[PDB]
Design a binder for this molecule. Sequence first.
Ligand SMILES: NC(=O)C1=CN([C@@H]2O[C@H](COP(=O)(O)OP(=O)(O)OC[C@H]3O[C@@H](n4cnc5c(N)ncnc54)[C@H](OP(=O)(O)O)[C@@H]3O)[C@@H](O)[C@H]2O)C=CC1
Ligand SMILES: NC(=O)C1=CN([C@@H]2O[C@H](COP(=O)(O)OP(=O)(O)OC[C@H]3O[C@@H](n4cnc5c(N)ncnc54)[C@H](OP(=O)(O)O)[C@@H]3O)[C@@H](O)[C@H]2O)C=CC1
Ligand SMILES: CC(C)NC(=O)C(=O)O
Ligand SMILES: CC(C)NC(=O)C(=O)O
Ligand SMILES: [Mg+2]
Ligand SMILES: [Mg+2]
Ligand SMILES: [Mg+2]
Ligand SMILES: [Mg+2]
Lengths: 328, 329
Amino acid sequence: AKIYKDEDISLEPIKNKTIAILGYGSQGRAWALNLRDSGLNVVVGLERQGDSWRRAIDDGFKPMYTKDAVAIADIIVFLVPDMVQKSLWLNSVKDFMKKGADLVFAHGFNIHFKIIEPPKDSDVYMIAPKSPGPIVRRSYEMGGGVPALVAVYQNVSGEALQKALAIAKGIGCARAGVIESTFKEETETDLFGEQVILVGGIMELIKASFETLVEEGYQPEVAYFETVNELKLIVDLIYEKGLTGMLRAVSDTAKYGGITVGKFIIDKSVRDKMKIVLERIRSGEFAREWIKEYERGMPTVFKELSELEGSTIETVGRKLREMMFRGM
Amino acid sequence: AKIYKDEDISLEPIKNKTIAILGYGSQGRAWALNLRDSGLNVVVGLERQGDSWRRAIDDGFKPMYTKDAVAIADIIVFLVPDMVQKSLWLNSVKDFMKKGADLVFAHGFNIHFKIIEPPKDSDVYMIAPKSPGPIVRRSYEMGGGVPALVAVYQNVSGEALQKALAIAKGIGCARAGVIESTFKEETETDLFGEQVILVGGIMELIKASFETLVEEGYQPEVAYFETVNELKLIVDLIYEKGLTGMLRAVSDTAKYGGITVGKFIIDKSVRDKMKIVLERIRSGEFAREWIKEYERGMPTVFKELSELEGSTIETVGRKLREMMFRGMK
Ligand SMILES: NC(=O)C1=CN([C@@H]2O[C@H](COP(=O)(O)OP(=O)(O)OC[C@H]3O[C@@H](n4cnc5c(N)ncnc54)[C@H](OP(=O)(O)O)[C@@H]3O)[C@@H](O)[C@H]2O)C=CC1
Ligand SMILES: NC(=O)C1=CN([C@@H]2O[C@H](COP(=O)(O)OP(=O)(O)OC[C@H]3O[C@@H](n4cnc5c(N)ncnc54)[C@H](OP(=O)(O)O)[C@@H]3O)[C@@H](O)[C@H]2O)C=CC1
Ligand SMILES: CC(C)NC(=O)C(=O)O
Ligand SMILES: CC(C)NC(=O)C(=O)O
Ligand SMILES: [Mg+2]
Ligand SMILES: [Mg+2]
Ligand SMILES: [Mg+2]
Ligand SMILES: [Mg+2]
């Protein structure tokens, strides 16, 4: 597949266009900052004069209410939570946007699961960074970037994909590599990844590892160094040199232990569970369940955050990180 | 427990000791380099004039054969593979070392599982960096370090712990933090962690994730960006801000997906397996199995390496890494 880099993409398609960034959270702050640094014309649109509005002011923007931002926008980017996008659309975008403005997403959930039906005369496209928001900004500030997918749902203009690629360049992603995908592929692979590995799987693997050692009477600080802190060091090797480069760096003891236990921990049953997860994403069932959970108040989310924040792994970790990270 | 940092530890107890680093592999190169850079007296001792001998010359050392390094050493550090240590001991150390020289390990396996029984008149101690070898070096070259455990098996001098802490400081680990442990704790926790998460769990999680997407027909490059490359970005957040910091950074959709599916994937059956893995470490069974597998020629290890290096995840990953890492013109 073509991997696009800076040299493959022009910013010209989105120059002299007003880009309204709707929201100023994890992705929103990063896009708005990186696009402004890249010399594009950004306005921040917000529903509330609260925390993110204050943050935008502190970063040197003059935020607008959504309705006012969209009225002047040539490109509108939905960087509020997925579960909020429908109501934002209906209340502050649909009737306020310029006719023919581009509608742009960072995840394909709302378009792919037919939550929002866009106007037929708007380009509709996506840039989905394969990264958490704060690292979309950090990478960019450090002169790098993160990979992204681009995708097009409607190409009225004849240059939707070029626009998508230009925004990806503007937020740094073409420093790393951008691949063309579809709204279906992106939504299904993004949901799957964060569910089974990037959030779900790694967090539960960490917590189960750490808690096994602490339950068995080992020093919790040892546990944290072994099952949390070292993970970053190992994953850095994978990131640079693959699983092969990581495995060559670790002891033969660890190679034998890992190769045999890994397959014991992550066995055919876990593989079957990944296929079930993927199925429930592809059928729309996950999206149905998420919508219902949000409409209940997201208690699963809030309950987990409160229990986690005060749990042993996090209190021992905060203490140790403060000690480790004092610096020179 | 006390977490010792640079300001808590003196180098004085190992000044003017000759330190023989036996081996020059993943840990050995890092220890040798970092201790030399710290100003300590290091000699590299090797059985073979092969690859690590050439690497040590390239790095500015004048390696010695083991027997000759140990004969002038005050501190002897076993940084060859765990399964080689007994033969090294019997053939090139026991009968050649100075009487009373310190015997030092980076993992407690050989002492804890009674493979090597040291002389009664030597200090025996350990510095176990909680990091892969190349990062022990890299951290140090970047003015930082990695955490370590220290532990004492025999304190004949009265200053074994102080020496272990001094080495830990010499290799940079007291820039991060050093904690006192035991040969038993370190061996058991270390084996556990690399088995269930740092090597075994994460590599099989990654492969299973990636493979599921490729089997199901998605672009392998997408699968790599999603299930391999991004993990580093996420784990960086955990490393800095814990699980809470990570989870606050990702989308609400991802918080709900992860919280629910994570507990599906890593369920009670997996937690029970982790207790069983631990049990087999504590009972000796893992150590038994490892020894037997080594004596077969470590086929499990070599077969996996050969299969892995040629596998889709690795070939697709090498291609993409080379593209991602080219950098700005
Ligand atoms: N987070 C991530 O790293 C990634 C996210 N994505 C996608 O990016 C898009 C945005 O997600 P993300 O950055 O996590 O969003 P956030 O959850 O960080 O969005 C917070 C922003 O939305 C505003 N907002 C929150 N609730 C409402 C409300 N009820 N009504 C009006 N505005 C509100 C907040 O304003 P206030 O300050 O007033 O609360 C703030 O500006 C999603 O499509 C997501 O899937 C893509 C890649 C990764
Ligand atoms: N790897 C890691 O990151 C970690 C390792 N440890 C511990 O550190 C210790 C050392 O491990 P590690 O660094 O992985 O070792 P390596 O596997 O990297 O050791 C390679 C070194 O040992 C020499 N060697 C290999 N085979 C033999 C042989 N049959 N006879 C003589 N010398 C030989 C090699 O010489 P040549 O070039 O001639 O082959 C080379 O100098 C172990 O106790 C381990 O558990 C602790 C923390 C993490
Ligand atoms: C792992 C996480 C940053 N990825 C996402 O796609 C998200 O937050 O939705
Ligand atoms: C994960 C790995 C670097 N840790 C070890 O302790 C080892 O290699 O034995
Ligand atoms: Mg994602
Ligand atoms: Mg997502
Ligand atoms: Mg270890
Ligand atoms: Mg180990």
